[PDB]
Design a binder for these strands. Sequence first.
DNA 1: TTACTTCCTGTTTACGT
DNA 2: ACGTAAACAGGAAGTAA
Lengths: 95, 93, 88
Amino acid sequence: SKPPFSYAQLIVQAISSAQDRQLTLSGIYAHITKHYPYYRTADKGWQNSIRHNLSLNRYFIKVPRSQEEPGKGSFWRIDPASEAKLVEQAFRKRR
Amino acid sequence: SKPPFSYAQLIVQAISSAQDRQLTLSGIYAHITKHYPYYRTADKGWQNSIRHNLSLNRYFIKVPRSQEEPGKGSFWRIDPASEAKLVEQAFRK
Amino acid sequence: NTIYLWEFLLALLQDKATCPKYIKWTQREKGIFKLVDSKAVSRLWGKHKNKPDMNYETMGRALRYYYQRGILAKVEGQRLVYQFKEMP
DNA sequence: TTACTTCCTGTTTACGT
DNA sequence: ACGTAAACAGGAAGTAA
């Protein structure tokens, strides 16, 4: 039932799916939930994991929020430096 | 001045030093650092190595923490089965 | 009922059945103390407003609040340790 | 007004496989 | 190739006094 992908990979996937290559934490969450039902917003552990990942990985870069929808959080995008590779591998299942 | 001992050996030593023959990861770390200044908590690689060792070696057994002291990490002891031998050899450069 | 969080903490510290177990003094002289069993303490605190499952996250917010007032402060580097600034 | 509380987003630490 | 749990910060909006 647990998707064989790394939280980072999931995040990358989510970002790629976004129309502008950006997403709010909430947006990311949503993306994950819609894709994979195993990750029910009900339990928060995975959410925490995601947040941790975001905080850590230097290739996740943080964008300041706008007056288009000023609500919960800032926008997340992938560092162009190593984006392409990440995107490619984003759907590479685990052995 | 890298100590000529195996991470496992170091762990064993640490455990033996403990008053109750147990130690938390943190405790182990501390023991190592005090004994051998070469292992500065500054760099984390050796710590990782230690953790790896703990995870692997079947003769290192994990004790779950309690509501007498709910804190950071669990307790580590040596499997009585082959403890004595380990202790003996623990300082065999 | 009609109790502050700091006051509750102090009470806990004072009473023998919670004196070391859930909270202890690091440096009683400087009013420094350490939440041993953070969770339990939080729960207890919550109990006073019924709020049964009070998590040390919510309770931590409260403590943080105390920073601006100048009642508590953070012991920056020690896990689960704060310092009362107002004391006898 | 003060005093927490719920909730959210984020950073950071620590342990264990 | 992380997974997971928890500490610690602070804005913002709710709730109670």
